[PDB]
Design a binder for this molecule. Structure first.
Ligand SMILES: CC(=O)N[C@H]1[C@H](O[C@@H]2[C@H](O[C@]3(C(=O)O)C[C@H](O)[C@@H](NC(C)=O)[C@H]([C@H](O)[C@H](O)CO)O3)[C@@H](O)[C@H](O[C@H]3[C@H](O)[C@@H](O)[C@H](O)O[C@@H]3CO)O[C@@H]2CO)O[C@H](CO)[C@H](O)[C@@H]1O[C@@H]1O[C@H](CO)[C@H](O)[C@H](O)[C@H]1O
Ligand SMILES: CC(=O)N[C@H]1[C@H](O[C@@H]2[C@H](O[C@]3(C(=O)O)C[C@H](O)[C@@H](NC(C)=O)[C@H]([C@H](O)[C@H](O)CO)O3)[C@@H](O)[C@H](O[C@H]3[C@H](O)[C@@H](O)[C@H](O)O[C@@H]3CO)O[C@@H]2CO)O[C@H](CO)[C@H](O)[C@@H]1O[C@@H]1O[C@H](CO)[C@H](O)[C@H](O)[C@H]1O
Lengths: 159, 159
């Protein structure tokens, strides 16, 4: 049955989904703030993650202002990071809207489509497959580009 | 293709969609406020609408505090209001979240599934079919249960 679930992710924490995200489902992260002038990351300023049942990082979205790039990657929980995909000009991806932002991920089965507000910044070919059982938003209190609490909304049972 | 579109609807206005919403698509209205003590409507306090290309109300969602009900209906532009589907106890539907709210509409072709926050309030069997080409949020700045501006986010091209 189609459903909507809402989660409040505080910076530096994760949440387990009550309804898993699989092929055809959607997850949108909402930030009630946007600080594109934050200091240097360590190396990341902000990261958004979708975890599989087995603990794998299905999709890792990392925003690095200092390197002016958004990174997309995957990795096993006990393995190394795999092949990174990069999008240049972080600030430009959020152009049009200020004071807040929205990041959407579509699980298309063999790929993850990431959209910043209304702009699809990448069709990321999966390096690791499976359904998402957990999410996390990692960042410090001083250098995150998003608010202290990031809200995640999932639309599941779509297919 | 799958896409995300954002619209800011000021009370009493409507917007034409850049991407029409059809079977398998989703639209969520976000309110940055929630006043269940707004007072008696005239008769409605707030309405959210999905219009067909010809102006027909495909889905009319009316929040009526004085009657303590949420009304769902449809009608042709020159026709009478059709059969109302009433959900009682407005406060219960928004329970769990204060200060704001979100109303989601799933277009399943034969029905419109409406979800307030995480709670599915109705599986509205359509009385009129067709694609949604426009949306509206109607209310006065005096008695609306939502903020002056409501943001509509559509997820289209899903099917
Ligand atoms: C800290 C950092 O920026 N890490 C990113 C890394 O950048 C490389 C250097 O970092 C190390 C690391 O700690 O991972 C340094 C280690 O000594 C290296 N290990 C070994 C055995 O040599 C690793 C290793 O080379 C990579 O992991 C291989 O992929 O890299 C980083 O210090 C260096 O920074 C430059 C800087 O850009 C330049 O301006 C300055 O003048 O010199 C500095 C030092 O040379 O750049 C290195 C090359 O990139 O690069 C990897 C990708 O290759 C990652 O981006 C890594 O960050 C992780 O990325 C993950 C997602 O892919 C995830 O976001 C993690 O949270 C990140 O830490
Ligand atoms: C103003 C209102 O509440 N309208 C809703 C209506 O309420 C009925 C009475 O309103 C009329 C009307 O103007 O529509 C009065 C007309 O004289 C009636 N027409 C005829 C030919 O008799 C119509 C007609 O019966 C209906 O349209 C048929 O569906 O109804 C309203 O005055 C009456 O008020 C009661 C009050 O509810 C009660 O608490 C109080 O103690 O006594 C009052 C006087 O008796 O209540 C009537 C209830 O039927 O009812 C219809 C549904 O039957 C709608 O709810 C209508 O509101 C419209 O709803 C639409 C969606 O379905 C849409 O949201 C429109 O914007 C609403 O105006």
């Amino acid at each position: 049955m189609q459903g909507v679930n809402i989660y409040n992710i505080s910076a530096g924490t994760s949440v387990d989904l009550a309804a898993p995200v699989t092929t055809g489902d959607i997850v949108t992260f909402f930030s009630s703030a946007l600080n594109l002038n934050a200091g240097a990351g360590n190396p990341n300023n902000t990261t958004l993650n979708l975890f599989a049942e087995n603990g794998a990082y299905l999709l890792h979205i990392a925003f690095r202002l200092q390197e002016n790039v958004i990174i997309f990657n995957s990795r096993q929980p006990d393995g190394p990071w795999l092949v990174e995909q990069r999008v240049s000009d972080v600030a430009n991806q959020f152009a049009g809207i200020d004071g807040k932002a929205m990041v959407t991920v579509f699980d298309h089965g063999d790929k993850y489509q990431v959209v910043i507000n209304e702009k699809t910044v990448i069709q990321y070919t999966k390096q690791i497959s499976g359904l998402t059982s957990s999410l996390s938003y990692n960042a410090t209190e001083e250098t995150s580009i998003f608010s202290t609490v990031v809200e995640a909304v999932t639309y599941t049972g779509l297919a």
